[PDB]
Design a protein around this motif. Sequence first.
Motif: not given
Lengths: 97, 97, 97, 97, 97, 97, 97, 97, 97, 97, 97, 97, 97
Positions: E5, E8, E70, E73, E77, E85-86, E89-90, E92-93
Amino acid sequence: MPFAEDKTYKYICRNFSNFCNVDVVEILPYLPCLTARDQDRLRATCTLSGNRDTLWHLFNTLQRRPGWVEYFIAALRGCELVDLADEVASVYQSYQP
Amino acid sequence: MPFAEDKTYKYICRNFSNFCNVDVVEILPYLPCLTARDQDRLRATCTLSGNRDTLWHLFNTLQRRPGWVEYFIAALRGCELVDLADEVASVYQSYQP
Amino acid sequence: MPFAEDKTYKYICRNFSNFCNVDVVEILPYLPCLTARDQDRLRATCTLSGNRDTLWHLFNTLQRRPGWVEYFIAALRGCELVDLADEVASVYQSYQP
Amino acid sequence: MPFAEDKTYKYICRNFSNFCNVDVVEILPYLPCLTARDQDRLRATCTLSGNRDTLWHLFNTLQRRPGWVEYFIAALRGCELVDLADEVASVYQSYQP
Amino acid sequence: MPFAEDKTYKYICRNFSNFCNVDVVEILPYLPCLTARDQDRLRATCTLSGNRDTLWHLFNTLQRRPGWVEYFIAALRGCELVDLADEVASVYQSYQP
Amino acid sequence: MPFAEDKTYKYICRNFSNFCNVDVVEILPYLPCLTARDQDRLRATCTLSGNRDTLWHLFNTLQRRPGWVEYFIAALRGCELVDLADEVASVYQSYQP
Amino acid sequence: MPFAEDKTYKYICRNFSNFCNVDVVEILPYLPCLTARDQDRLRATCTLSGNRDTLWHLFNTLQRRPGWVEYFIAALRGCELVDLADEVASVYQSYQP
Amino acid sequence: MPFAEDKTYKYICRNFSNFCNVDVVEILPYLPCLTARDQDRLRATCTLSGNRDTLWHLFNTLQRRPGWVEYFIAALRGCELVDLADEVASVYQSYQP
Amino acid sequence: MPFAEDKTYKYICRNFSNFCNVDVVEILPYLPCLTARDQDRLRATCTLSGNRDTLWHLFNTLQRRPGWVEYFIAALRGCELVDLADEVASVYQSYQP
Amino acid sequence: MPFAEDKTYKYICRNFSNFCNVDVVEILPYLPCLTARDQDRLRATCTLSGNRDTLWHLFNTLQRRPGWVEYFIAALRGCELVDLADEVASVYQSYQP
Amino acid sequence: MPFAEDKTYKYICRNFSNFCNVDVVEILPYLPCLTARDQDRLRATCTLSGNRDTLWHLFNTLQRRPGWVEYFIAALRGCELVDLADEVASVYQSYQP
Amino acid sequence: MPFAEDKTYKYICRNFSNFCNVDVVEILPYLPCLTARDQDRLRATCTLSGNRDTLWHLFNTLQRRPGWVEYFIAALRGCELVDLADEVASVYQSYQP
Amino acid sequence: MPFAEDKTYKYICRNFSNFCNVDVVEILPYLPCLTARDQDRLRATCTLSGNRDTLWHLFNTLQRRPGWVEYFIAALRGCELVDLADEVASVYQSYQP
């Protein structure tokens, strides 16, 4: 010290009442001859003590490097202190043969 | 002092030009081996004098406690000084049998 | 210092990366044990220097008064820092006989 | 300091009249090499003192991390200061063998 | 800070050109993790200075509370910023084991 | 400070959760004991920082002038804060012999 | 803030999507607890900025006076918002012992 | 911002004399990408100040959402502004590779 | 600053009585050299403080970018200020060799 | 400030409940002593904040110019506030020898 | 030091609890006997350290110049500290023959 | 030194771990027995060296004047150090016949 | 400092009660002798602290440049402060031979 440039420094010491308006902080960036250590300790002194307590340290440090009179005069003219700059220039030529 | 760790300290003394960018204040919290008295006097010196005048005191104090090289390397990496950290690590392994 | 409360302070010094998010200014009103002089100098430091430069002064001042752990835990819970508060509470009970 | 990158910093110190228009606050987000502590103290200085009093601190902090010239040039171009950026780039190539 | 986290947040600092369109005022009601003091000072800054001068303060304040990715994001949206936002999210993973 | 009026101020410091709803700006005109300088700096702080960051400065400034409790109680009643005013009045009589 | 009434305010902050239809101007005359200054500044904000930018100021101002939940519920019923009023009433009784 | 769509926005800023005839109010219903808050504040500005004072806010808000050029061109054609719409379309294709 | 363009700025500072009629808001769209951040903070200042309090910020910001005199003269002519524009143009040619 | 006119201003500060009905906007044209800058910033404050938030600024600005009591009394009579005007006039003569 | 004026200074040292409310900054302009250097260093101390850390320096500096009691009493009366001023005046007459 | 008061000083020397939290600077104003020279040199030492390096000088200077135990106990109670004050008081009565 | 112009500055220091109505911000544009750095730091001080806290800095900075009395008198007349301007002019001629 029977040199023209060193004898100019003795003029500043004997006449301090007319050099008390020089602001240390604003004139520091316009004196490139000062080293990184020398330019760092002066700002620390101004933060701890007052401003006029730093004036002696500025002049004592400046005279170490030869050719400091030309840089000092140029900085004074560029900081709207032309009256003081002309006084120093006349004294400088009063000692050169 | 024919020890691998002590001989690393002599490298710092002989090569001081490349260790002058270490900021004393920001790296102090990341050196837990320093005592409360040792960590208090360093901040007093930085307030009175400049920053580079404290660099000698920081390195002289750090080497007293054994195992200080591992903590020094870790702190340098975490403060975006990876180039300096790699240089010290290579020197450390150059002395261990 | 073989006391349970003092040994908790040494935990903070050794683990500083996870205590850097504590904001000095917002947590000051929720620590009534600090004196008027102690609570006044901290705000002056935060105005002059940054925020993380004050974190060491806050923790160093807090540990002087006995019973500071209970107040520190309560303040952290009330400022939406429950994850950090639970970590400190577990360490506190790890030293009490 | 006989390195190409360090010698570029000495150019800035000697020529300060043409680097006084760099705004500290707007250019800070475009310099990712600065740490969280370094980027926090600069904003505190600009709030307390003026803007040009911070210019020395910005340049002194920037030169610590190697490879800062490339980031400095890119930021100047993106902030509509192309004339200043071209001047710095020419000086950088004047020292590389 | 070797956490998924926290890493990021470093992505946002290094890529600021694509996060400049986030409006501070409209997104504040959709971030319930911010405290009453934190949500009050941000509006004062936006009234005094501009809008982009507040973007650094918003991101610096947001990362203090764990689990902020979380909520960030979800807010993006719901404010017609699905493209941004997308992207977050990418990232973060990309760090989670 | 073994006086009845000064000991009331210590009650406010120890119980801050129930005094956070006092609005600084609206109550300033109803406190005539504050000087022109004291009443001017408070408004500057509220414009720069938030509102709750000024609460400490308001209470710290108020207690300097003797007889401030009577004016504080009267202002609270006139601003539809009777519940808080009654609490302070009871504490004031708890210390007077 | 471990009180039943204050904890209701935290419900509004966390669930803002279902409280965005409350019109500030029409509901102001039906809230007699607001002072003359408080009721005057809200109309100025609605004229300058939009309507939803005022919603945060209305809720932040309302919670200052104790007993505001009963007045808020009554106003919602009288403005044809019975569905929202029933939701708030159920939450209020969920916290009272 | 080296993108084709963002560079179109810079064209509008540099050529403002030929975009002053766009009426804000009539074109708002034909721009569905604007949010409820964004579409509400624009009407408040037009009521308080004039019409041309809102033109900057309309263009600044429009460019935030990607793909705004296609919607802007379509709205201009449907409001009998075909001459302006053709000019914008030609500029858009001048930047796409 | 011995340049023709910089010396024009000193003329404005010394003669401020005849430059007080320049309206900041109406002339902003006709100065494309200003950045998005620079053009946003000026409108915030005009909303908070008066109009003449912004005049210093407009002129101080304008002179940073080289070639600002040509854009300033063109904007003044297009805003029915031809008398002021002719005065500035004559001063500009008085310094060029 | 042992002058008759200055001591009248202290009467207004101590008795604010009976001076809250003075409307700032309607009385501004009838006070010719206010400068163009002073009369412009007051209208900006009334648009941003409420009306009673401007009352302190009006009285603080008015007392700077000597002879402001005569103009203040005349304006109050001409705006159907004769009861307040008579009260101020009696206080003015209570201090003159 | 068997003088009436010097013996008053010893009263301040022995009774410090009732002289802690004197604000250094606000009272400095009303003490014309202080020199330019003396009045400059005091403000530097208040910026670095707290306020009460400067109280000793203010009193130690004040007593150097003879006749400082009359100026100290006058300043206290003019800063709404009449209760403290009367206490000092009574002590002054208790030592004069 | 077979006196009750002198033997208390030997207790401090033998038990130094529990007297390290006494802050020299804050307690100096509350010890009126110290002379002007003695109170001036202590502040100079704290500025040059750390804080704990001054603790020995404070205790060594304090014990010179008879009756220093009563003043030391009173100062500790007034600086929120009641636990340490009670310990010293018990030791004092353990030696008196 | 036995000069006519410097002795005028000592008059201001000794008589501060009648120079407290000078507004720093409005008079700054009418003093062209102040440098860019000097005119920038004054506005920063007025934003952080109050207005009267800046009055000392304005007068201390003004007296550095010779011939400042003529500019000060002219600015006071143009800002509807003729009564104060006449007082200063009479004092100036009281010292010239």
